[PDB]
Design a protein around this ligand. Structure first.
Ligand SMILES: Nc1ncnc2c1ncn2[C@@H]1O[C@H](COP(=O)(O)OP(=O)(O)O)[C@@H](O)[C@H]1O
Ligand SMILES: Nc1ncnc2c1ncn2[C@@H]1O[C@H](COP(=O)(O)OP(=O)(O)O)[C@@H](O)[C@H]1O
Ligand SMILES: [Ca+2]
Ligand SMILES: [Ca+2]
Lengths: 375, 232, 375
C-alpha cells in the first residue's frame, strides 16, 4: 500500500492480458490483446489516427479496425507495438510507476531464448526495473492447495501444456507443448460454418465468434448418439439473435468444433486426443508413480469451462489405462485465475530472492542471466 | 465540435512535445502527469491542467443571433446595455468571438511596445494580514517564481560584491582625478578617465551602464594599493 | 477584420452559390447561378446587351433572358462566363479583393482531373492567389457536432452523395455518386404536368417550378393510400394563384414527383431507392461496424426539407436490414448550411497549412499538385 516497495502482479498471454494492482488476489484489469490500423484513413485529421486502437477502446469499436495480431505462438511480428501496450497498463488504470515497484511475468515453456532477453531489455534499459522475474505458468497454479504430489494441465489461448509437475520438474520428456488452444478454436469455427453458408470473413467478426462461443456452445459427449438426436429440434436449435440482426441457430455447430480437441486429425496432425497425451506423460515416469497421479489431475485454464469437458475424461482415461486405483481429476471451478492466485504468492515470497534477478545481476552475467542460471 | 477533449489532447502532444520548453507524461516519464493531462513549463515552475469543460468554456464563439435579440427590444436599458455602436472597436461586427478575444490581447501588447513604461512590482507579507509576521516559504517563493534575483545577476551582470555608479560616485569623489562637476557628461569617457590615469588594463574591469563590476574581493586591495604607490 | 490576411468562405454548386464575408458563420450573399442572352437584341443600344444578366439582376427580370446553363454535372459548356461570375461576388458585394485574402472552395467528388486545374489557373495566374484550397462537400458537414463515428449523405442541386465518412474515408467503394438532385427535380415536374395540359416550356418558367415547389409541394408517405384519398378535395387541392394570373391546383402533383426519388425506375435507370443505396454502403464495410452506423445517419442538404422525407426512411430501412440496434438518422434542421458551418472552420484551422496549397507549391509539382498529393 505505502511502506515497502510493494510488487505488482501480471500474467500476459497471446490473447488476454491479466494484470491488477499490488498484493491482490485476482486480476483487476483484463483488457483484450488487440491492435490494428485504420486501413480506411481515420478521418486522418479527426485524430492522427495512429493508436491501432487498444483496450476497451478498440474492443468497443472494432468496425473500422484492421485488428493486426502481433504475438503468434513464439514469433512476435513486431515489438514496437508491445511497447505502447505496456505503457497503458501500469499508468492509465493502475496509476502506479514500474520505476518504483518490482514486476512479475509468466513464461511460455520452450520460448526462443532471444525473446526472454528482448523483453527484459525493455524494462532494465528504459523502464528501469531493478527487480523482476518470469515464472512458469503451470507451476504457479500448483502452489495453492494442500499437497506436493499432483499433475497439472495448464492452457488458455497460447498453447496446450501437459505438465506432470508434482514432486519435481524436468526429467525425460513427459511434458508436452501443443499449439492448439483458444485462438485455434476461434479460427476453426469460421471454416466449418462455411458448410452452411455462414462465412465470418474479416478478423473483426472473427472475434465475435469467440464472444458467442462462451455463452452456449458445448462439447459433444458422444458425437455418434448426438448425431441421431439431430432429428429433434429442441436440444439442437439454439437461439442467439445477432446483436446486429440475424439469428444463427447453432445446433449441430456447437458440439462439432470441440470434437477437434479429441480428434486433432481434423487439423492436419498426428497428435492424439488429450487422453492419449495423458498416457504419454505417465508411461515415461517410474512405475510406482502412477497410482497417485490418477488420484490427482489438475486441470487449469478457463478453456476447461465448456459444458462436457470433464465428464469425457473419465470415459477415455479409464479405457486404455491401469484400472485399480482412484481415477480422479482436479478441475478447479474457476481455474482460469489459478495462475494469478499463484502469481500473487511468488511476488510476496522472500525465498523469491534466491530466484529473482537484481539490476546488477543482469550486467554481470550478460543478457542470458535469466535462463542461463534458472530453469 | 466533433473534436472533443481527448482528440484535442492528441493535437497538442503531437504538434509539440518536441518543440523546446514543453513536457508531458509520454516524453518526460513522470507519474505525476496523467495520461490525459500535460506538463506546461512557464518561466517559473510547473503546472498541470485538467480537461473538464475545455471546449464550451473556451470556444467563446458568440454569433449575431443572441446579440441582435436584445437590440431589437423595447426598453431604455435593454438596448442601453448595448451602447452607441462601435466604441473603440468597430472594423466589422459579424465574426466568431474566438478572434475577437484574440484582438483584445493584441490591443494590449501593441500599445505597450512603442512607449516608455514604468515598472512597479509588489510582494505580499503574509496571508493572515499580520503586521510583523513573515512567511519564509511563501515570500521566498514569490522572489523565486518572479525571477528577480536573476535580474540581480543579469540586469546587473552577475558576480560577488556589487556597487553602483551613481551611489559609488557620491562616495569616492575626492579620491579620483577629473571626476569633478567639470565632468564632460559622457559616462563612458568619464569612467575611462577614472582608470586610465592610474594605469590599469582594459579587460581587468567590466563596465556596463549602471553598477560597477570588480571580480573577487582581493582586487579591491589591488585598487587601494595601486593608488598608494603612485603618489605618496 | 483588419490584422492577419483573413480568409473568405465560399461554396459553389451547380445551381446556387453560397458566399459571404470573412470569419462568418453563414452565407451573406446567395445569388442564383444563371446567365443567358437576349435572343431578342437588348434594345442593342439600350445597353451593349452582353451581360446574359446575372445575380439578383437576372433573377429579378427573367422574361427577356434565354437562361443558358453553363455547368451541367462535370462538363462546363463554357468557362468564359464563369470568369465574370466570380468578378461580381468578391467585389460588388463583399467589397474585398482576392488579391489579399485566401480562398476556400468545395470539391464535387469524382470530378474530371482537368477541371480542378483549370479553376486554379484562373486564381494563381490572374487573380494572384498565394493560398487557397478545395475541400470535399460532405466531410465539412461532419466536423461540427460532437463525435468521430457518423455516416453522411450530402446533396443539393449537383449530384447525390452517400458518403459513410465517420472514422475515415475511402476503402472499397461504399461511397456513391448519383446524378439526381435539385436540377433533376425541377426538370421532371414540367414533363409530368403535361398530362394535365400544363406545359411550362421555356427555361425561364422552368425556374418558376422550383420557386413554387419549395412552398407547398411535399413527399408521398405511401402513394397507395394517398391515391384513394384523392376522392376528397381538402388535403389534395392546394391553392397557389400564379403571380401572373391563373391558379394551379397542385393536388396529386405535389406528392407525385418526389416518388421518383424512391423509384428511379421512372427516370430510366436501375438505381434503387435511397434506402437500398444505404444498404449498399453498409454491407461493404466490416461486420462489427453496422450497429453504430444505424445509431447515427447524417442527412445534409436543403433538399431534405420536403415534408415527408425523414419519416419515410424509418419505414424502409427497418424493413430489409438488421433490426436489433438503435435505428437513428440525424437530419440537421437547417442542414443546407451544414457545409458552410464546416467551411468557416477549415479556413480558420492552422493544421490547414498541412493540407492547403502555397503559391510556389503549384509550380514545383505542376498543375496536378492538388489531387496528386491530397485526396
Ligand atoms: N465463462 C467462460 N466459459 C468458457 N470459456 C470461457 C469463459 N470465459 C472465458 N472463456 C474462454 O477462455 C479463453 C481465455 O482464457 P485465458 O485463461 O484468459 O487464456 P490465455 O491466458 O491463454 O489468453 C477464451 O477462449 C475465452 O472464450
Ligand atoms: N425551405 C425550403 N424547403 C425545401 N426545399 C428548399 C427550401 N429552400 C430551398 N430549397 C431547395 O434546396 C435546393 C437548393 O439547396 P442547395 O443546398 O443550395 O443546393 P446546391 O448546393 O446543390 O446548389 C433547391 O432545390 C431549393 O428549391
Ligand atoms: Ca496459456
Ligand atoms: Ca451539392
Amino acid at each position: 500500500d505505502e511502506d515497502e516497495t510493494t510488487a505488482l502482479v501480471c500474467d500476459n498471454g497471446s490473447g488476454l492480458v491479466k494484470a491488477g494492482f499490488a498484493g491482490d488476489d485476482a486480476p483487476r484489469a483484463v483488457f483484450p490483446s488487440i491492435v490494428g490500423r485504420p486501413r480506411h484513413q481515420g478521418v486522418m485529421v479527426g485524430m492522427g489516427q495512429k493508436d491501432s486502437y487498444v483496450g476497451d477502446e478498440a474492443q468497443s469499436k472494432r468496425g473500422i479496425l484492421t485488428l493486426k495480431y502481433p504475438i503468434e505462438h513464439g514469433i512476435i511480428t513486431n515489438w514496437d507495438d508491445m511497447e505502447k501496450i505496456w505503457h497503458h497498463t501500469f499508468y492509465n488504470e493502475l496509476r502506479v510507476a514500474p520505476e518504483e515497484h518490482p514486476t512479475l511475468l509468466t513464461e511460455a515453456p520452450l520460448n526462443p531464448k532471444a525473446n526472454r532477453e528482448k523483453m527484459t531489455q525493455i524494462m532494465f534499459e528504459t523502464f528501469n526495473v531493478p527487480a523482476m522475474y518470469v515464472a512458469i505458468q503451470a507451476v504457479l497454479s500448483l502452489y495453492a492447495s494442500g499437497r506436493t504430489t499432483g499433475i497439472v494441465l495448464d492452457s488458455g489461448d497460447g498453447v496446450t501444456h501437459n505438465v506432470p509437475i508434482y514432486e519435481g520438474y524436468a526429467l525425460p520428456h513427459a511434458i508436452m507443448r501443443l499449439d492448439l488452444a483458444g485462438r485455434d478454436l476461434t479460427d476453426y469455427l469460421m471454416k466449418i460454418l462455411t458448410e452452411r453458408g455462414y462465412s465470418f470473413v474479416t478478423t473483426a467478426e472473427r472475434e465475435i465468434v469467440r464472444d458467442i462461443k462462451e455463452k452456449l456452445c458445448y462439447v459433444a459427449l458422444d458425437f455418434e448418439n448426438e448425431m441421431a438426436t439431430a432429428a429433434s429440434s429442441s436440444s439442437l436449435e439454439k437461439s442467439y439473435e445477432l446483436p446486429d440482426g440475424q439469428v444463427i441457430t447453432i445446433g449441430n455447430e456447437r458440439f462439432r468444433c470441440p470434437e477437434t480437441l479429441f480428434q486433432p486429425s481434423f487439423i492436419g496432425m498426428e497428435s492424439a486426443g488429450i487422453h492419449e497425451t495423458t498416457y504419454n506423460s505417465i508411461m515415461k515416469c517410474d512405475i510406482d508413480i502412477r497410482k497417485d497421479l490418477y488420484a490427482n489431475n489438475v486441470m487449469s485454464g478457463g478453456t476447461t469451462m465448456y459444458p462436457g469437458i470433464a465428464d469425457r475424461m473419465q470415459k477415455e482415461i479409464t479405457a486404455l489405462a491401469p484400472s485399480t486405483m482412484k481415477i480422479k481429476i482436479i478441475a478447479p471451478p474457476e481455474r482460469k485465475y489459478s495462475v494469478w492466485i499463484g502469481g500473487s504468492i511468488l511476488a510476496s515470497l522472500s525465498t523469491f530472492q534466491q530466484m529473482w534477478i537484481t539490476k546488477q545481476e543482469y550486467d554481470e552475467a550478460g543478457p542470458s542471466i535469466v535462463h542461463r542460471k534458472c530453469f | 465540435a466533433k473534436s472533443t477533449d481527448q482528440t484535442f489532447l492528441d493535437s497538442i502532444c503531437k504538434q509539440f512535445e518536441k518543440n523546446p520548453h514543453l513536457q508531458s507524461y509520454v516524453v518526460s516519464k513522470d507519474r505525476s502527469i496523467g495520461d490525459t493531462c500535460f506538463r506546461l513549463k512557464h518561466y517559473a515552475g510547473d503546472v498541470t491542467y485538467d480537461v473538464r469543460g475545455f471546449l464550451d468554456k473556451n470556444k467563446d464563439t458568440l454569433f449575431g443571433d443572441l446579440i441582435s435579440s436584445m437590440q431589437s427590444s423595447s426598453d431604455p436599458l435593454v438596448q442601453g446595455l448595448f451602447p452607441p455602436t462601435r466604441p473603440e472597436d468597430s472594423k466589422k461586427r459579424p465574426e466568431t468571438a474566438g478572434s475577437q478575444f484574440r484582438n483584445a490581447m493584441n490591443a494590449l501588447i501593441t500599445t505597450l511596445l512603442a512607449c516608455s513604461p514604468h515598472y512597479v512590482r509588489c510582494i505580499k507579507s503574509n496571508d493572515n494580514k499580520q503586521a510583523g509576521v513573515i512567511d519564509e516559504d511563501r515570500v521566498r517563493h514569490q522572489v523565486r517564481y518572479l525571477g528577480l534575483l536573476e535580474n540581480v545577476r543579469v540586469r546587473r551582470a552577475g558576480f560577488a560584491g556589487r556597487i553602483e555608479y551613481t551611489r559609488f560616485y557620491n562616495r569616492y569623489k575626492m579620491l579620483c582625478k577629473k571626476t569633478w562637476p567639470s565632468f564632460n557628461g559622457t559616462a563612458k569617457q568619464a569612467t575611462e578617465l577614472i582608470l586610465q590615469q592610474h594605469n590599469i588594463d582594459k579587460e581587468e574591469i567590466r563596465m556596463g551602464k549602471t553598477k560597477v563590476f570588480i571580480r573577487n574581493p582581493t582586487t579591491l586591495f589591488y585598487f587601494e594599493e595601486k593608488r598608494e604607490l603612485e603618489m605618496p
